[PDB]
Amino acid sequence: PEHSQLTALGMDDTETPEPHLGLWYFIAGAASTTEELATFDPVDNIVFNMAAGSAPRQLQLRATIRTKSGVCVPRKWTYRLTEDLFSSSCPGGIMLKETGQGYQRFLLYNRSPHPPEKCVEEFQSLTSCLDFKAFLVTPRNQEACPLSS
Amino acid sequence: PEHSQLTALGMDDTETPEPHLGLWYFIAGAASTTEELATFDPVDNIVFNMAAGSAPRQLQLRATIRTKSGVCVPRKWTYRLTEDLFSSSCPGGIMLKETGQGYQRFLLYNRSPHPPEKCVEEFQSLTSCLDFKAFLVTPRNQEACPLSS
Numbered sequence: 001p002e003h004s005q006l007t008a009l010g011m012d013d014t015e016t017p018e019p020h021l022g023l024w025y026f027i028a029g030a031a032s033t034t035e036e037l038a039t040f041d042p043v044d045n046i047v048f049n050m051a052a053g054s055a056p057r058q059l060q061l062r063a064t065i066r067t068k069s070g071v072c073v074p075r076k077w078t079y080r081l082t083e084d085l086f087s088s089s090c091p092g093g094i095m096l097k098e099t100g101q102g103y104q105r106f107l108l109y110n111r112s113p114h115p116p117e118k119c120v121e122e123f124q125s126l127t128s129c130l131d132f133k134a135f136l137v138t139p140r141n142q143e144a145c146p147l148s149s
Numbered sequence: 150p151e152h153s154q155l156t157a158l159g160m161d162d163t164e165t166p167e168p169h170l171g172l173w174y175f176i177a178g179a180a181s182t183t184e185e186l187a188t189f190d191p192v193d194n195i196v197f198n199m200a201a202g203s204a205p206r207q208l209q210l211r212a213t214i215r216t217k218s219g220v221c222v223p224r225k226w227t228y229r230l231t232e233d234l235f236s237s238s239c240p241g242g243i244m245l246k247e248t249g250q251g252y253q254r255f256l257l258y259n260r261s262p263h264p265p266e267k268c269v270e271e272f273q274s275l276t277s278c279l280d281f282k283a284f285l286v287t288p289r290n291q292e293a294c295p296l297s298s
């Protein structure tokens with residue numbers, strides 16, 4: 001089972017509930033090339049929940065993508081899990097690193113659909129610092145899409 | 150001419166003189182694997198100057214490495230140049246990214262042989278954040294070595 005790889009890189013540890021409960025939102029991505037972010041160009045917003053993957057060391061995201069054009073695309077994604085920022089800039093936040101052969105991207109989620117702008121700024125600033133200058137912030141102009149139970 | 154690649158990633162812009170004049174010191178390195186830093190294990194300190202490389206888009210470092218065992222190894226290195234941190238944490242600092250096929254490392258220099266410890270801490274913290282957890286700080290217990298003119 002070859003899946004894309006997630007590594008938790010840091011989070012706001014004071015947020016509730018634990019990560020496998022409740023909803024998360026997709027805020028922004030940073031990568032070294034535009035290709036590693038292009039998949040998100042049609043996205044307005046993403047609401048999702050994270051679950052343990054039944055098989056070991058696995059994460060499942062159940063998502064509904066709100067599209068810039070206004071429609072909703074439901075999605076169930078399975079990943080392999082790997083074997084400052086959130087202290088003030090990003091309350092309710094989590095940053096993950098997505099990895100497979102030939103690609104890397106950093107992904108910024110939040111418990112809130114509209115976190116304080118200084119979160120995206122600090123994430124941009126930090127990733128830009130280390131030369132991951134391809135950057136994408138979801139516009140989040142539209143309502144979230146329905147997501148099951 | 151295939152050389153290792155340097156990209157200036159940020160610097161304290163208030164330091165004098167311009168980078169191609171005066172001396173610099175090697176403070177620390179961060180990479181994703183120990184292999185990308187192993188070359189520096191025998192190092193106590195490095196004093197060097199940076200020069201334009203006569204051929205275009207090229208940088209030359211003339212260095213003398215003080216070795217942990219106490220000796221001095223002179224060095225002339227030629228690189229290809231690419232086509233927050235320093236605002237407070239690292240006065241006199243510069244961070245570079247060294248790159249070639251199959252490897253990346255971030256390199257921290259300073260005008261001063263012993264910058265304030267909160268510089269190394271912020272560089273460690275920032276690189277560690279983005280999952281570049283192989284880390285090396287030169288011990289700098291010994292005197293710098295002589296370097297020409």
Ligand code: NA
Pocket residue numbers: 129130158159233234235
């Ligand atoms: Na920087």
Ligand code: NA
Pocket residue numbers: 009010084085086278279
């Ligand atoms: Na972090």
